[PDB]
């Protein structure tokens, strides 16, 4: 559903778009039937993309931003048609009138869209996700037979995205062909895809771009796997709290597949 102001057979002025479940997914304005000015695109997971659109109404420019679900942490910079070419870490300081004002964080790390393949998990296996690194850490699990576990660095309420589950993308068939010892870290993304963190990447000294594969299974979990559109990893899953969680609590999830 689209709701917009129309002047002379054409959309002109404020407009909002909802998806089937009724979630607001876009807020902006149109000019001559084309999106115009500063527009906001919201993803079901709470993340968003904001910036002045180009003349074809596309999220293309040098001052576009992807904003994480805390509505504060952002990756600011060059995007073409919504795909991040080069984003730098920043903080959304305020939104006077329609527009966001960003403050860059110190540092030289730049981020870009880097969806994985069957073989390659990442062009920067050791560049941590900035939003996740402030929320969780890996340490020895309190489940005895488990080994390492994922813990919260801070206290947060229900429905909070804490970690991302990225990995190589392979087929359900390949996973169901050879077996068990190699399937420790597989998660079904969709009917056609399975995400896996194999080989040497299962260890944080070798891969720490995302840490979701570290959460252990539990039958009374405090988190859940959820779909997530990430500006660097693409369509993946994230780990979201099911209830309030205190600082240093182990995060556990129900079986995915």
- CA-nearest of 93, 100, 10 to 50 is 100
Any binding-site annotation on 146? yes
Exactly one of 137, 225, 230, 257 is catalytic; which is it? 225
Q: What does the DSSP 8-state code read for residue 214?
A: G
Are 137 and 248 a contacting pair, CB within 8 Å?
no
Beta-strand pair 250-253/216-217: parallel
Exactly one of 30, 66, 111, 213 is catalytic; which is it? 213
Any binding-site annotation on 222? no
213 is catalytic: yes
Q: What is the rounded CA–CA span in Å between residue 84 and residue 186?
A: 27
Phi first, then psi, for residue 51 (nearest 5°) are 170, 170
66 is catalytic: no
Dihedral class, residue 151 (left if φ above 0, else alpha if ψ from -120 to 50, else beta): beta
207 is catalytic: no
Exactly one of 30, 76, 111, 165 is catalytic; which is it? 165
Any binding-site annotation on 217? yes
Phi first, then psi, for residue 43 (nearest 5°) are -95, 150
Any binding-site annotation on 216? yes
Exactly one of 6, 101, 203, 217 is catalytic; which is it? 217
Q: What spatial distance separates the first Cα and last Cα of the chain, rounded to whole Å?
A: 32
36 is catalytic: no
165 is catalytic: yes
Q: What is the rounded CA–CA span in Å between residue 226 and residue 237?
A: 5
- Angle at 131 (CA atoms; ends 43, 116), nearest 5 degrees: 70
Q: What is the rounded CA–CA span in Å between residue 45 and residue 219?
A: 24
Exactly one of 6, 101, 203, 255 is catalytic; which is it? 255
Could you list the residues known to form a binding site, using ranges: 146-148, 216-217
The residues assigned a catalytic role are 165, 213, 217, 225, 255
Could you list the residues known to form a binding site for S-adenosyl-L-methionine, using ranges: 146-148, 216-217
């Amino acid at each position: 559903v689209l709701q917009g102001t129309y002047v002379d057979g054409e959309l002109n002025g404020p407009a909002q778009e909802y998806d089937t479940d009724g979630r607001l997914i876009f807020k902006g304005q149109y000019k001559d039937n084309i999106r115009h000015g500063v527009c906001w695109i919201y993803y079901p997971d709470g993340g968003s993309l904001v910036g002045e659109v180009n003349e074809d109404g596309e999220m293309t420019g040098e001052k576009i931003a992807y904003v994480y679900p805390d509505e504060r942490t952002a990756l600011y910079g060059k995007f073409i048609d919504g795909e991040m070419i080069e984003g730098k870490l920043a903080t959304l300081m305020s939104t006077e009138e329609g527009r966001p004002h960003f403050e860059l964080m110190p540092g030289n790390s730049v981020y870009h869209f880097d969806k994985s393949t069957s073989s390659c998990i990442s062009t920067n296996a050791l560049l941590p996700d900035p939003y996740e690194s402030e929320r969780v850490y890996v340490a020895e699990s309190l489940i005895s037979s488990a080994g390492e576990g994922l813990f919260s660095k801070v206290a947060v309420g229900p429905n909070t995205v804490m970690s991302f589950y990225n990995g190589v993308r392979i087929t359900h068939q390949e996973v169901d062909s050879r077996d068990w010892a190699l399937n420790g870290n597989t998660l079904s993304l969709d009917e056609e895809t399975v995400i896996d963190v194999p080989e040497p990447y299962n260890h944080v000294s070798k891969y720490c771009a995302s840490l979701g594969h570290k959460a252990n299974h539990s039958f009374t979990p405090n988190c859940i796997y959820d779909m997530f559109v990430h500006p660097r990893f693409g369509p993946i899953k994230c780990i979201r709290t099911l209830r309030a969680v205190e600082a240093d609590e182990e995060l556990t999830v129900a079986y995915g597949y």
